[PDB]
Amino acid sequence: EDLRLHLLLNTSVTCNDGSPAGYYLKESRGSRRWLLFLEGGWYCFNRENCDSRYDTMRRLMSSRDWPRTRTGTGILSSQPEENPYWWNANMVFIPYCSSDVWSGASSKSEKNEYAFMGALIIQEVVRELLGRGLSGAKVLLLAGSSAGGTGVLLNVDRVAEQLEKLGYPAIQVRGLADSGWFLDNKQYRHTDCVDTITCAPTEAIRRGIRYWNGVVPERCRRQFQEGEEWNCFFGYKVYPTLRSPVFVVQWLFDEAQLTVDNVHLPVQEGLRLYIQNLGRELRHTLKDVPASFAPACLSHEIIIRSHWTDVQVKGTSLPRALHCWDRSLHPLKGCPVHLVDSCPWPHCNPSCPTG
C-alpha cells in the first residue's frame, strides 16, 4: 500500500545479520510535518537468544525478506477518518531489525556475530531523508511503540542534536513514546533470567547494553555514569533529562510489563494487590509528565493499530490529546494534554481495547 521501502544507501548501517537497514516512506508534498515511527518487538541479549530470534523472528533481524511496501495504519494512516491527528504528514515507518531497543552502535565483525546498530539506523534514516524533503520540515515527530517507544526516549535528543549540527536548527524535534515506559520493579514471582520474555526488567537491560554496545542520552549517562547506563532505559529516569518535548502513551497495566514481572492472567489477594500497586506506581511516575495518555487497561495494543481512535481518558481520545499537544507547542480550554486514568483495575475504563 502507501509506504514504499528504501534500503539505506549507506550499506554499513545494517540489521542484525548485516543486511541493509531501511525505512518505508510515503511523502505528502505540501506538508512540513514528518512522522518517523520506530517499530517495536522485544530484543535479544546474548548469542543463544539472538540465534533463536533469528530462526523464528527473522524479519526483526534482517531485511532480506522485507516487502517492498507496507500499509500505513493508525497514526501512520493518511486517511483523516483513521488518523484525525496527522493524516496529511509525511509518513516514515522504520523497521526494527536491530533487537537492541534502538540503542546499539556495534557492527557485525570477526568479534560480533550480530550487528546492533539501532541508534545508527535512526541517525542514517534522518540523514538520507533530508535529501528527500526533510530539509524543509517544520516538525519532526519521532514516534514508536513498545521497544520503539523506549527507542524514542533514548534517541529523540540525539536526532535534535544531529539536525542542529547539520545546520537545520528550525526543525522542531519532538517525541511520542508509546508503550515504552517501564518500571524496574520487583517481579510478582521470581524467575531466573534465561529467556528475554520473563527476564526481570533490570537484569535484561544490564545484559543487553553490554552485548549491544548500547548508547543512552548524554545527560542521563552523566547522571548514572559508567556501568549504570541501564537506568536510562527506564522512562521515569530518562525523561527528566530530555530537552525535546515528549508525549508519553502508556497503558497502566501494560502486558509486556506484566510479562517481565512474571504475571500471567480468579485473582486472589496477593496478585490483586500486586496489579493495583503496579497501576498506582505507573500513575505516580506520570504525575509530572504534562503530555501523557495513560488508560487503565490491560493491553499490548499500539498507536499504529487502525482503531487507535477508540480509547478515551476522561472523554478525550489520543488523537485529540495529540492535537491539543500540537496547539500547546505553538492550558487550553477543553483541549487537555495530561490524561492519566485514576481508577485502579484493568478495564475500569470502559473504552479499553476489547481484545
Ligand X SMILES: OCc1cn(-c2ccc(Cl)c(C(F)(F)F)c2Cl)nn1
Ligand Y SMILES: *[C@@H]1O[C@H](CO)[C@@H](O)[C@H](O)[C@H]1NC(C)=O
Q: What DSSP line would sit under 6-34, residue for residue?
A: EE-SSTTSB-TTSSB-EEEEE--TT--EE
13 touches ligand Y (CB under 6 A): yes
Quick one: which of 1, 4, 12, 194 contacts ligand Y (CB under 6 A)? 12
Nearest-5° angle of CA 80, CA 83, CA 85?
95
159 touches ligand X (CB under 6 A): no
* Tally of CB atoms within 10 A around 305: 15
15 touches ligand Y (CB under 6 A): no
Q: What DSSP line would sit under 85-117, residue for residue?
A: TTTTSEEEEE---SSSTT-B-B---SS-SS-B-
182 touches ligand X (CB under 6 A): yes
Taking CB within 5 to 8 Å according to partner kind, which of ligand Y, ligand X, none is near residue 13? Answer: ligand Y
Rounded Cα distance between 25 and 27, Å, is 6
Looking at the Cβ atoms of 158 and 206, the one nearer to ligand X is 206
323 is an active site residue: no
Taking CB within 5 to 8 Å according to partner kind, which of ligand Y, ligand X, none is near residue 325? Answer: none
254 is an active site residue: yes
Taking CB within 5 to 8 Å according to partner kind, which of ligand X, ligand Y, none is near residue 256? Answer: ligand X
| The one-letter amino acid at 28 | S
Q: Are the CB atoms for 221 and 238 separated by under 8 Å?
A: no
C-alpha cell at 304: 499504529
Stretch that binds ligand Y, among 6-14, 129-137, 143-151, 303-311 (CB under 6 A): 6-14
300 is an active site residue: yes
CB of 87 vs ligand X, minimal distance in Å = 26
234 touches ligand X (CB under 6 A): yes
**Count of alpha carbons within 13 Å of 77, Cβ hemisphere only?**
17
Taking CB within 5 to 8 Å according to partner kind, which of ligand Y, ligand X, none is near residue 12? Answer: ligand Y
Rounded Cα distance between 89 and 148, Å, is 20
Q: Of the residues 300, 310, 328, 351, which is catalytic?
A: 300
Quick one: which of 260, 286, 303, 337 contacts ligand X (CB under 6 A)? 260
Q: Which residues bind ligand X (CB under 6 A)?
A: 40-43, 101, 146-147, 150, 180, 182, 201, 204-205, 233-234, 256-257, 260
